[PDB]
Amino acid sequence: SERLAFKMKLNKGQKQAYKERHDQLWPELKQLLKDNGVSEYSIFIDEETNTLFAFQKVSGDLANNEIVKKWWDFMADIMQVNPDNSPVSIPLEEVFYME
Amino acid sequence: SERLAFKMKLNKGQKQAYKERHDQLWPELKQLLKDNGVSEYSIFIDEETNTLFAFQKVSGDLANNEIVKKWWDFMADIMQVNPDNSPVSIPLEEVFYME
Numbered sequence: 001s002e003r004l005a006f007k008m009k010l011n012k013g014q015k016q017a018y019k020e021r022h023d024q025l026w027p028e029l030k031q032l033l034k035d036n037g038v039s040e041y042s043i044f045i046d047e048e049t050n051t052l053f054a055f056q057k058v059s060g061d062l063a064n065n066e067i068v069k070k071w072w073d074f075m076a077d078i079m080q081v082n083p084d085n086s087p088v089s090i091p092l093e094e095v096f097y098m099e
Numbered sequence: 100s101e102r103l104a105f106k107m108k109l110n111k112g113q114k115q116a117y118k119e120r121h122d123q124l125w126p127e128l129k130q131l132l133k134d135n136g137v138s139e140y141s142i143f144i145d146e147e148t149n150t151l152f153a154f155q156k157v158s159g160d161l162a163n164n165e166i167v168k169k170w171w172d173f174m175a176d177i178m179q180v181n182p183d184n185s186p187v188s189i190p191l192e193e194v195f196y197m198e
Binding site for chain 1: 141
């Protein structure tokens with residue numbers, strides 16, 4: 001019901017690892033995201049700037065979920081992350097929408 | 100049927116003008132986009148970097164359309180544009196999708 005977008009940062013040269021790990025995204029994480037109202041979740045890359053742009057829809061607390069935290073730990077070597085291994089994330093404000 | 104994303108550049112300090120002009124997007128342009136298979140077209144801003152991230156769905160030649168070109172001309176003072184007034188646009192490759 002709501003559209004959300006955000007920017008993340010990949011470490012230089014890690015597009016391949018990022019893509020392969022996401023091709024093998026744990027089914028537990030996919031189901032948790034769905035159970036929490038997430039759909040149509042896409043992540044796009046600007047490889048030359050090591051930038052990820054994420055878009056998702058949310059239909060109404062994953063940061064405290066054990067599986068999410070395990071995913072952060074698994075990804076922390078190739079992403080720009082905080083001390084708790086969650087990815088740095090910059091929110092992006094919607095300025096236009098046409099259905 | 101296809102998801103597309105791309106990055107554009109706004110001139111410094113022009114978020115307000117960009118948003119107001121898009122709130123008043125010409126109905127002719129909305130209809131042309133729909134007629135050409137575009138839906139769920141969102142544009143998000145990272146204001147501190149003057150960056151626009153666009154997402155849209157396309158269900159199967161707008162660059163040569165007179166109304167599109169008029170829109171480019173109308174917007175050219177506040178966007179980073181080419182000599183023909185079309186916005187500079189960097190495509191972003193999808194690296195993850197979960198329906």
